[PDB]
Purine nucleoside phosphorylase deoD-type
Amino acid sequence: SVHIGAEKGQIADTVLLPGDPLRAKFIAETYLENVECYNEVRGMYGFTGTYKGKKISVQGTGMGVPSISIYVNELIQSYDVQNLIRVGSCGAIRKDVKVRDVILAMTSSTDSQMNRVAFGSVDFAPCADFELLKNAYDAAKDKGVPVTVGSVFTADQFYNDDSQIEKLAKYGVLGVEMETTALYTLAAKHGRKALSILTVSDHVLTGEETTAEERQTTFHDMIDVALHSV
Amino acid sequence: SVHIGAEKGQIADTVLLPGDPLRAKFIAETYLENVECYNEVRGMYGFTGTYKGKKISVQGTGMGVPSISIYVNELIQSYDVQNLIRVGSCGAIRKDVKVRDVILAMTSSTDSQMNRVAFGSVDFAPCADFELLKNAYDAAKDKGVPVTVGSVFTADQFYNDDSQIEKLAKYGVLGVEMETTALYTLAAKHGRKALSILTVSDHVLTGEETTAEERQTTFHDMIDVALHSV
Amino acid sequence: SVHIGAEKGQIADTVLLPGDPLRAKFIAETYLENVECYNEVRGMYGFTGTYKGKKISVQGTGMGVPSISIYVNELIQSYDVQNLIRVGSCGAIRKDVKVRDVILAMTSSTDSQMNRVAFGSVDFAPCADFELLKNAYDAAKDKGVPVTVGSVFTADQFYNDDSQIEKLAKYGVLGVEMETTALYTLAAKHGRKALSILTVSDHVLTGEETTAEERQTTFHDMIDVALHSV
Amino acid sequence: SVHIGAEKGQIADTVLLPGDPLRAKFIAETYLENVECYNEVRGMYGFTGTYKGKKISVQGTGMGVPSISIYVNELIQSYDVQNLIRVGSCGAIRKDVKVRDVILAMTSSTDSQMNRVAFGSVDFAPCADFELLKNAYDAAKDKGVPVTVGSVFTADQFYNDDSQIEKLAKYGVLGVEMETTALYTLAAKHGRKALSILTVSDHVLTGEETTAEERQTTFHDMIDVALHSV
Amino acid sequence: SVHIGAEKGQIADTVLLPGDPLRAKFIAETYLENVECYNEVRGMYGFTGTYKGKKISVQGTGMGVPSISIYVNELIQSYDVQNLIRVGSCGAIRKDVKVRDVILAMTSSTDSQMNRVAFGSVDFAPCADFELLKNAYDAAKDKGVPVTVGSVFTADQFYNDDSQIEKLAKYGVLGVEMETTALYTLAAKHGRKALSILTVSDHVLTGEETTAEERQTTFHDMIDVALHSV
Amino acid sequence: SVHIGAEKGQIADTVLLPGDPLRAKFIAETYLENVECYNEVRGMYGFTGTYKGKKISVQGTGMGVPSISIYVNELIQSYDVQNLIRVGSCGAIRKDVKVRDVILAMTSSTDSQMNRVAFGSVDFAPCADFELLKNAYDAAKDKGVPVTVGSVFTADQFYNDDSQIEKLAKYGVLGVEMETTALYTLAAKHGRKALSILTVSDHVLTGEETTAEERQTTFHDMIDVALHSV
Ligand SMILES: Nc1ncnc2[nH]cnc12
Ligand SMILES: Nc1ncnc2[nH]cnc12
Ligand SMILES: Nc1ncnc2[nH]cnc12
Ligand SMILES: Nc1ncnc2[nH]cnc12
Ligand SMILES: Nc1ncnc2[nH]cnc12
Ligand SMILES: Nc1ncnc2[nH]cnc12
C-alpha cells in the first residue's frame, strides 16, 4: 500500500492507533517486547512487538478524519487487520467528565462531510464494536480503573469560530476529538472491529488544563486497558 | 399535558414504550400486578402496574419519530419520567441477524430531519444510556437470552421507494424501525436514561416472514430482559 | 396489508382521515348509517358506513408524517382507494385566521425530510386535487359556511425549540399541523385525489385557546363540508 | 427604482408579467386602449393601457428567478402594485397535459435555492392567491376556455443535464417554466396577490413541438382569461 | 437554437457578453465596423462586427444565472463559439477596490443552486481560462490601465434580506454580481474559454455611488481591455 | 502554539508547505544554506534556512484539510507568517494533464464541509493570491519550466468509493489532492498570501504510475519555481 512500507506479515491482527507517531514509538518501546519498525514512510511510524505472547502493532495515524482514513483503509485492505484500537486524547466539554476518567466511545457525532458524501439524506451513526467495548470495560472494572462510556464529537477544525460544542454538551456529548468517526465508519464498512479509548487532555469550555503528571497516569491506564482488553 | 390524561402520581419513573397500544395492554395485563389504565386519550393506552416491588408504566407511543417525540416530551416534562425503554419490532436488513436474537441499540442512524433541524451542519449520533444498556445486557446473559448489540436505522417511511437500506446493511446496520433516534435524542437533552430493545418481525432484504411462534417467543424474551433490567 | 385488517371490498372508494381513532369512531357513529368496523389493528379504528346512499370509510391515521404515510400507502396499494380527505385540526399562526374558519389547504410547507430524501435538490410542493378542493369550496359557499383557502405547514415536531413558524406567518402561511404534506405527496404520486380540511384548535403565537363549544361547531361544519363535497 | 424608468402614477395596481418584452408590446397594443410605454431601461419594455374601465400595466420580466425577482420587488416596493399575473409559456412534462389547456398554477416546486436560503431546513411551498385563481377559473369557465389547475416546476436551467423532470411528472407535476416560485414567494411576503397562467409551448419528454397555430390560439385564450379576471 | 435567431455563420468565434441588450447595441455601434444584427428574439440583441480585421459578436445575456446559461448554452451548442468574455458591472464590497479598477474574476462564489444540483456533495469552484485572463491582464498592463485580480460573488437575489456579503468581504471577495458563476461553469463544462471583466458601479456596504463620468471612463477601459486581449 | 515548538524569530515570513515532513527535511537540506530544525512535535518537522539572501521556512503539514488547517492557523496567528506556498503531489484526472507539467492552482473545489459550515447556503470558491501566482508563473516561464494553470479538487478521502472525480474531470478540473481548499480559505480570511504548486504523481482515471525519474525531475522544477518566486 502507498503510505505504508511494511512487508507481508509484518503487521499484526490487532493494532493500536495513536495520532502522534512519537507516541507510537513511545508505546512500542515501553510496553512491547522484540520491537521492529515496519513503517517509516512520511515519518509516520508503525512498530510491531509482543505483549504477553501476543503480537501487537502500533501505527501513528496523523491528525483529522482524512489522515486516519488513509491508514485505516490501508491496514484493512492491504494487511488484513482485524482489530483497531484508537488510543488518544480529547477535550472534555462537560463539567462531569473528570481528568482521570478513561473514555470509551460508543459512538461519535461529526461535522465531517465524509458520511454525508457517502449517504446523502441519512444521518449515519458510527458504532463501536460491542465485543471490544465490553472487553475494555471489563478490564477497567477488573482493575478499578475509572471509566465513562458515551459519545464523542469528531471535529473537522481544531480551531473553530463557528464551534457548536456548546449545544453538543447539552445533549450529553462527553468530548471532542478528530478521528473517531472515520475509524468507526470504515471498520464497520469492512466487517472489522474498532474501539476508541480516550483520555482528557483539557476542559474546552473553561480553558482549564490538566497537569503533566495526571496526563502521564491516565495515559498509562489507557494503554493498559487497551492491552489487557486484547 | 395535551396527549396524556394522567393525574399526578399515576405514571411511574420507569416507562416501557411499545409502539402498539394493544401490545401495551397485553404487556400490562400479562406481567404486572395491580394495574390501572391512566390514559385513553386518542386510544393511545397507558397503564401502571407493579413488578417485583417496583412501579412500571407501559405507554403506547404510536408509529414514527413525531408521534413518539410527543409522548416522550410529555412523559419527561410533565411527569418527570427518569427511565424510558422502548420495546418493539424492527426489520432485519442483514443475513447474520437471526430471528431469535434480541437487539440492544447502542445508537441509531436516521433519515429524519429532526436533528439536522436542531444542529445545522452536524451529524448528531444519538446514544443509549450505557447503564441501562449494560443492565439489560447482564440480565440477558443471566438467563442466556440471545442478544445482539449494535445500531439501527430510524426511517420516516415504512415504504421507502428510493431506499438506502442496501448501503446501511453494508455498514453493519442491523435493522430498521421508526422511533429510536427520537427516543435517544430527547432523553439525552433532558438528562434522562433511554434504551431501545428490539425483536425481528421479518427480513426486509429477502421479504420473508417470521412465524407466529418465533415472534411471541422472542417477544417474551424481550419483555423479561427489560423488566429484569430495572 | 400489514397495519390494516380489512377484507377485500370492506373499504370504500372515498375515505375520511382523522388523526384520532376515537374521532373516527365518533364520526362513523354520528353521521354514518349501517356502520361496520373493518380495522382494529393497533386500536387504529377504520369504519365503513353509508351517507345518503354512498359508502364512506373513516380511518384514524395517527400523528405525524410517518404514521399517516403508512395508512395512506396501504389504503392506496392494497384497497384501491380513490379519494382521501383529511379532516383535522391545526394551530393558527396568523391573527386573521378566525376560530370559526374552515380551512382548505391548497398546499403545505414542511420541515419533514421525506421529500428531500425523494428529490434531493428540488423543493417539492405538494398540491391538493383541485376537483376535491373546488367541491369542498362550493359546498361551503352553498351553505354560507365560512372558508379560507391557503397553505399550511406540516411540522415534524409538535414542541419546537427551533420553531420557525414566525417566519412562515410573514409569508402568508395560515397554520401548522402534522400530516398534510404526506397525504398530498403520496396521493399525487399514485394518481389519487387528496384534500385536507382543517379547523383551528388554537392560536399558537399568543397562546389563546378556543372554547369547547366553538370547536364542536366547527368540527360539525368540517365533516359536513367533507361529506357534502363527496 | 434601479431597473424601471417610470414616474409616479404611470404603473397600474394590476400588472401582467410575460417573460418576453416583445410579447409585452404585443399584448399592450392588441388588447388595450390608450397605451403609453413607461419603461425602456434594458429594453425590458413596460406599458400601461386601459381595459374596460381599468388600468393595466404589462411588464416584461426576463427569464429566470433572479430576473423576475428584481422586477417584482421593484413593482411591489416602489410602485405599490397589488395584483401580479404572470402570463407565459411552459414545457408540458406529462402526456395527459394537452396543448390547448390553459394552466393555472396553484403552487410551484423549484430547484432554485432562493427559498432554502431564506428558510434553512424548511421546504417552502409557494402558493397562489386563491381569489385571483378562483376569478381566473370562473372566467375560463364563463367562456368554456379549457383550463387545468395544478402545480408546476420552476427550473434554474432551461437545459438541465442531470434532469429530475422524469420524477416530477410521476408526482403529477404538469409542466416546467422558470419564474413562478419567485413570483408567488415575493407576493406572499409583501401581502399582495399573485397568480401564474401558462400555455404549453411543447412537450419536454417527447421533444415534440406545437404548431404556430395552436400556440397563438392558446395565447389568446390565456390573455382573455387574465384580463377578464380583473 | 430557440432564444437566438442567427443563421449558420453569423456568430463569430469570440463573443462579448454584456447583460443589457442596449449596451450590446451601444458597444457594437461605437467600437465595431460593418455591424449586422443577427438576433432580435426577445429584444435580446446580438450583433456581429469587425475590430481591426477580426470578427467579434456582442450579445445581451439578461440578468441572473438562468438567463445567462440559456444564451451561453446556445452560443456553445448551436453556434460553436470558442471565447466568451463577459463585460459587466459589479457592486464592490470591500473598501480597497476603487471605482477606476477594472476587475478580472479568477473565480466566483455563489448561492445559486445550479452547481449543487449538478454535484450534490462537492463545493464546485468555477475557474476562468488562464490564457484569456493573462491576455486581459497583459493588455491592461501594456497600457497602464489599473487592474485587480481576484474573486467575485454571483448572487441569486439582487435585493437580499439574508445577504451574507459581509462575511464574504472578510474572506477577500471583491464584489457581487449575477452571471459569472454560470459562464465559468458552462464554458469549462464544454471545453471553451470564458473570462469576466467587471467595473465597479457602486459600493454596496456604505451605499456610495460612483459618478456618471467615472463609469463612462471605466466602461471604455473595460471594452478596450476585452478587445485588445482578443 | 499547541503543535509547533518554535521560539520567537525562528520561523520565516515565507513558508513552504509539503505534506510529507521527510520531504521537508529533504527540501531544507538540498536547497537552503544555514538550516536549523525549529520543530519536532509529532515528528512533523519544520526547518528554516537561507535562500539567496532570504529566510525560508519549510514545514510538513500532514495529510488532509484538518491537519493542514491546524498548521496554517498556528503559522498565521502565532508566527505572523505572510506567504504560504504549498508544494506537493496530486492525482491527474484528465488525459491532457501530462506528467511533466507543474500545476499552479487558481482555485480549488472541495467535498470538505469546512466551508459549508462557515457559510451556510453559499458555495465558497477559495482563490489563490494572484501576485504569488503571477510571480510563480513568470519564474516558470523564465526557465521554460512547463506550467499549467487551472483548478484542483480537494478530497477528504484518498480512497473515495462513491467518487465524483469522473464528473469533475468533465468540468475541466485537472487533479485531486487533499489540502488546497484549507490553505486558500484560511490565508484569505487572515489577509495573507497563499498559492499551491503541484506535481503529478499518477493518473487516477487510468491507474498508471509515473516513473521514479519523472517524479524527481518534476519535483525539482516545482521547488525552483517556488523559491525563484520569492
Ligand atoms: N481541544 C480539542 N479540540 C479538538 N480535538 C482535540 N483533541 C484533543 N483536544 C482537542
Ligand atoms: N420492514 C420494516 N420497515 C420499517 N420498519 C419496520 N419495523 C418492522 N419491520 C419494518
Ligand atoms: N400547535 C400545534 N402544533 C402542531 N400541530 C398541531 N396540530 C394542532 N395543533 C398543533
Ligand atoms: N422545455 C422547457 N424547459 C424549461 N422552461 C420551458 N418553458 C417552456 N418550455 C420550457
Ligand atoms: N449591488 C449589486 N448587487 C448584485 N449584483 C449587482 N450587479 C451590479 N451591482 C450589483
Ligand atoms: N490519487 C490520489 N487521490 C487523492 N490524493 C492524491 N494525491 C496524489 N494522488 C492522489
Summary: Helices of chain A lie at 21-31, 65-77, 114-119, 130-143, 165-170, 180-189, 212-228. Residues 19 and 61 of chain A are 5 Å apart (CA to CA). The interface with chain C takes residues 120-121 of chain A (CB under 8 Å).
